[PDB]
Amino acid sequence: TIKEMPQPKTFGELKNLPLLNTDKPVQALMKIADELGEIFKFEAPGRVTRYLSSQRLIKEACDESRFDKNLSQALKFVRDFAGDGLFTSWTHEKNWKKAHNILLPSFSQQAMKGYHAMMVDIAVQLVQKWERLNADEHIEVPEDMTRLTLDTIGLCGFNYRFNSFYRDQPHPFITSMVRALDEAMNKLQRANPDDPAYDENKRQFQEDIKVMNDLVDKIIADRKASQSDDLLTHMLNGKDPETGEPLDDENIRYQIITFLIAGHETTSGLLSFALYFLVKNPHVLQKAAEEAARVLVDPVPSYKQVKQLKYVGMVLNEALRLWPTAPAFSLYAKEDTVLGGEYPLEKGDELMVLIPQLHRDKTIWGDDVEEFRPERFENPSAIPQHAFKPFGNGQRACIGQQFALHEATLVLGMMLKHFDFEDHTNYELDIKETLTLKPEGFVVKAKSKKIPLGGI
Ligand code: HEM
Ligand SMILES: CCCCCCCCCCCCCCCC(=O)NCC(=O)O
Numbered sequence: 001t002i003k004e005m006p007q008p009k010t011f012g013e014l015k016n017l018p019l020l021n022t023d024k025p026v027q028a029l030m031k032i033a034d035e036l037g038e039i040f041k042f043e044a045p046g047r048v049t050r051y052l053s054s055q056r057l058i059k060e061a062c063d064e065s066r067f068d069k070n071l072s073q074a075l076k077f078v079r080d081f082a083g084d085g086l087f088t089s090w091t092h093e094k095n096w097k098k099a100h101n102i103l104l105p106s107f108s109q110q111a112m113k114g115y116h117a118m119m120v121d122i123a124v125q126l127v128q129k130w131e132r133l134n135a136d137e138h139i140e141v142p143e144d145m146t147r148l149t150l151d152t153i154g155l156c157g158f159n160y161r162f163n164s165f166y167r168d169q170p171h172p173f174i175t176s177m178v179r180a181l182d183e184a185m186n187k188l189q190r191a192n193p194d195d196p197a198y199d200e201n202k203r204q205f206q207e208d209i210k211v212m213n214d215l216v217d218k219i220i221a222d223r224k225a226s227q228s229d230d231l232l233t234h235m236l237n238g239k240d241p242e243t244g245e246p247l248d249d250e251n252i253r254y255q256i257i258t259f260l261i262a263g264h265e266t267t268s269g270l271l272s273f274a275l276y277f278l279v280k281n282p283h284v285l286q287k288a289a290e291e292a293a294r295v296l297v298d299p300v301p302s303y304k305q306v307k308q309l310k311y312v313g314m315v316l317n318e319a320l321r322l323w324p325t326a327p328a329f330s331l332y333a334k335e336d337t338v339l340g341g342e343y344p345l346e347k348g349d350e351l352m353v354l355i356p357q358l359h360r361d362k363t364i365w366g367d368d369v370e371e372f373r374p375e376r377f378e379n380p381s382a383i384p385q386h387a388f389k390p391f392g393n394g395q396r397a398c399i400g401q402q403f404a405l406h407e408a409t410l411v412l413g414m415m416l417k418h419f420d421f422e423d424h425t426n427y428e429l430d431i432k433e434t435l436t437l438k439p440e441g442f443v444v445k446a447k448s449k450k451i452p453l454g455g456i
Contacts, residue, residue, distance in 0.1 A: 005040065006037055007036075008032045008036065014191055015043040015044055015045065016042050020188045020189040023432075023433060024433050025188060025189075026437065027431060027433070033051060033357045038056070038057055039053070039343065042352075048350070050350070051351075052354065052358075053354050053357030053360075054363070055361045055384065055386060058386055059387075060340060062393045062394065064394045064395065068332060069396040071088060071090065071330065072350075072352060077188075081180060081209045081212060082261070084096070084251060085254035085255045085257065086255065088258070091396060095247075098240045098243060099255060100395075102238040102239065105238070107400060112303075114229075116306075116406075117456075118152070118155045119156060121456045124453060124456050125148075126147070126148045126411065126414075127453055129144070130448075131453070133446070137445075139444050139446055140443055141442040141443060142268060142272040142438050145275075146164070146174060146264070147165055148268070148411060149265070149268040149271070150171060150173070152407055154260070156230065156231070157231035157259055157260075158219050158230065158260075159226070159230055172215075173212060177212060177261055179204065181265075181435050183208075185433060216256045223236070235247060235255050235256065265438075266404070266436050267325075273437075274319040277319055277372040279421050279422070287311055287374075288412075288416050292312065292412075296414070298454065301414065312416070313405065315412070316405060316412065322356070324356060324389075325390075327354070327355050329355070330350060331350070332348055333350075333351075359388065364384060417449075421446055422445045423444055
């Protein structure tokens with residue numbers, strides 16, 4: 001028998017919309033899920049969606065024969081600048097499968113081995129920056145992780161140096177990207193987006209989109225005036241084996257913007273949360289540091305050595321369990337269907353997967369879901385299907401998962417090998433939201449173990 005779906009408090013004609021009028025919407029939705037359960041309806045004028053938090057219902061949502069990727073309102077706003085790039089295209093648009101086929105080779109094992117040296121280049125810059133700090137100084141963690149991740153996707157993917165470690169202020173592309181993501185997030189609660197009160201928001205949004213595109217212009221120009229075989233090489237020259245066609249210029253521009261953003265923001269968040277959890281759990285930090293010291297025996301890490309940092313990998317997966325940095329994904333019903341044998345859906349109905357909640361399902365993980373325990377991932381293959389989804393689902397899953405994890409494992413391994421870390425301010429977790437999640441104001445002090453770093 002069908003069941004009435006729980007729903008949060010309403011605001012008259014605005015329904016639930018005002019619940020999104022907060023600078024921390026995902027965290028607000030997590031609290032609503034804690035109060036209402038595995039599923040709740042969320043209505044706004046002219047639209048409805050249903051938020052899923054349990055593995056038993058999410059496993060159904062992840063059945064590709066019944067549901068396909070949907071562009072949530074957030075992705076529709078991001079599409080204003082990411083167009084039909086891979087992250088914001090519908091599965092049925094020609095450019096999705098075409099770009100997917102052309103770019104998948106850029107994330108093969110062979111490609112990853114080829115990216116390794118450039119990843120080390122930026123990682124060494126991070127380690128040198130910290131080695132060079134004076135006794136009285138400290139590290140702004142998310143800031144430096146963003147310097148590291150943006151520079152890494154820039155160099156490995158486009159042979160372009162953002163030179164973020166040569167700047168004391170965030171890189172211009174970052175300032176505009178963050179403002180654009182913040183606008184998309186703030187636009188979620190706007191009942192009347194065309195009210196003149198938002199003209200300055202619109203003007204600033206166009207300005208930020210222009211800055212990102214001006215950068216894309218530079219990357220394209222520098223490649224033209226430059227022999228590489230990287231992500232950009234495939235975007236410019238690769239042919240889809242199905243159609244035999246290469247991407248057109250417009251889509252290429254969207255892919256560059258897409259990869260510069262998806263290719264670093266969430267990885268900066270991951271590294272930031274991983275270091276946060278490590279300093280808050282001394283015993284776990286000790287285990288991870290022991291592995292880094294034992295495994296990374298050379299001046300700089302080799303590809304094989306990074307693959308051997310098992311515990312560091314577990315630490316990263318546990319950080320993704322608690323705070324998956326792209327916290328949700330959306331789906332739509334391909335045909336009428338019944339969810340969990342109790343909730344009838346009509347073709348087209350939308351669902352939102354609240355990843356942080358899925359990852360706190362006590363019926364899967366046990367009651368200690370709030371504890372940071374990397375050991376949960378000792379044998380990742382044994383976790384029930386669809387219980388852990390920080391990288392999305394099926395054919396629309398993250399194309400750069402291995403890239404992100406290789407980069408994060410390498411850098412965290414080097415960090416743990418070279419410094420002892422101190423949470424000198426007893427930092428209180430404050431998670432800033434820009435659709436994606438990242439600690440804000442997280443600072444630490446790093447005391448060098450004075451171990452020489454090898455040449456790049
Ligand atoms: C730990 C860091 C990362 C996390 C948590 C993450 C998470 C995700 C998630 C959840 C999706 C699916 C979104 C949806 O269904 O709406 C996704 C898609 C995607 N990600 Fe990642 N990602 C990460 C790093 C990266 C990196 C480093 C790259 C580029 C090298 C990347 C490129 C993409 C692209 C292009 C897609 C769209 C794939 C497609 O639909 O064809 N991601 N990612
Ligand atoms: C071009 C690359 C774009 C990368 C963007 C990555 C961001 C990931 C999205 C995280 C999910 C945001 C969720 C915001 C809260 C919410 O419930 N929104 C509902 C909605 O947008 O319809």
